[PDB]
């Protein structure tokens, strides 16, 4: 046997950044944002729910122990993978390497977008054409997309959880909620610890988490959707 | 009022025989199936399997047409057929046992046994193989099987050095030619495309999800998720 290339490949819409177009497709969903087309599978949802039970075969108990706050805490809730991707994108927009070559006006726009992705589930954010008309240039759009791909790429530098002191996670605080992204065998576990405000006003610690399949990000980390 | 992104190690982790490899049995489990072979426990997901069928039947949106065209020998071929990831893993593992780096780490008494296992995994779909005690020229220790497992882990590890299909001339496939049978393993975004071509010219293909092998790609044990 030997390595060989047989199936190798042969060698605008600015307002798309303000849209979050989710739509069901074969094997899951498609989400369009910017010039990215995300293909989200239904993978792991059944497993994730089952792992919150303590009546799992012994091989899964280590997993439940490692993520106690997620699996051995009944109060934590599982979110759909496309919501977890949305959260992941919100984090990417705040990447230090991305916001370093942006103009301040557009930087503040990116900030609004980031908050919209992290805190909301709405399909659109409305920003005044006055700010977009001077700050959202083709260059800034290009850089923004290049930055997100770059963040996806550095996520693949993460090692899957291991027993030999290797960085398996990325932690960040954004708009009053601790976000943790961990690489597992199935992809990236996206975990958010926030404070929920329930209407007398009552504040409580809340934990949500979802699983973004590796293929979702690998498609946009370096082609074809397969 | 917020912090910055930081790499974190917060989630750090703190007897074989002939009969253990002589079976290929699919066990029902949550989210798919479990296959036990040697000291390997394969978790095969029941997902990513519907997409291949749609791509074959052309029940897809137009964004997948370049994918159907790139793999025209798989999705645009009347004499192509899809096997479940359970059988695609079987083929893949069969090829693994034929790895040269694994072969040179064995002994002819054990090499002949491994070869029999390989042909059984590659050419058959039977759940068990019975090798007559006569054929065993030597005793088989647990250690010989252990280093065989290491060889398999190493083959998985080499498959992860493949790049996804690209346009930079980077290797994205492992080919192996046998007796009237060609086997190609291609790394896509969703995992590894395993196809087998025979003669007339028929082809059979399936998909092995990246998680199946990722779990067993490193020397360290780790955790199933």
UniProtKB/Swiss-Prot annotation, chain B:
InterPro entries: Filo_VP24. GO terms for cellular component: host cell endomembrane system; host cell plasma membrane; membrane; viral nucleocapsid; virion membrane. It is a peripheral membrane protein. One of its GO terms (biological process) is viral process. It is found in: Virion membrane; Host cell membrane; Host endomembrane system. One of its GO terms (molecular function) is structural constituent of virion. Its main location: virion. Signal peptide: none annotated. Pfam families: Filo_VP24. The keyword Transmembrane does not apply. Keywords: Host cell membrane, Host membrane, Membrane, Viral matrix protein, Virion. Disulfide bonds: none annotated. Belongs to the filoviridae membrane-associated protein VP24 family. May act as a minor matrix protein that plays a role in assembly of viral nucleocapsid and virion budding. Unlike Ebola VP24, mVP24 has no measurable impact of host dendritic cell function. Monomer or homotetramer (Potential). Interacts with nucleoprotein. This is Membrane-associated protein VP24. It comes from Lake Victoria marburgvirus (strain Musoke-80).
């Amino acid at each position: 046997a030997e390595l060989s290339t047989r199936y190798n490949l042969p060698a605008l819409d600015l307002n798309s950044t303000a849209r979050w177009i989710k739509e069901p497709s074969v094997g899951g969903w498609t989400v369009k944002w910017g010039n990215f087309v995300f293909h989200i599978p239904n993978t792991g949802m059944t497993l994730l729910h089952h792992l919150k039970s303590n009546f799992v075969v012994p091989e899964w108990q280590q997993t439940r122990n490692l993520f106690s706050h997620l699996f051995k805490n009944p109060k934590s809730t599982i979110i759909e993978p496309f919501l977890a991707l949305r959260i992941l994108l919100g984090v990417a927009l705040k990447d230090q390497e991305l916001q370093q070559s942006l103009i301040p006006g557009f930087r503040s726009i990116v900030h609004m977008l980031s908050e919209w992705l992290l805190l909301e589930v709405t399909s659109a954010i409305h920003i005044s054409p006055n700010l977009l008309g001077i700050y959202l240039t083709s260059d800034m759009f290009k850089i923004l997309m290049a930055g997100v791909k770059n963040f996806f790429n550095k996520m693949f530098t993460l090692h899957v959880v291991n027993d030999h002191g290797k960085p398996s996670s990325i932690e960040i605080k954004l708009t009053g909620q601790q976000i943790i992204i961990t690489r597992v065998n199935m992809g990236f576990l996206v975990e958010v610890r926030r404070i929920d405000i329930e209407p007398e006003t009552v504040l409580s610690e809340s934990v949500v988490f979802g699983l973004v399949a590796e293929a979702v990000l690998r498609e946009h980390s370096q082609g074809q959707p397969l």
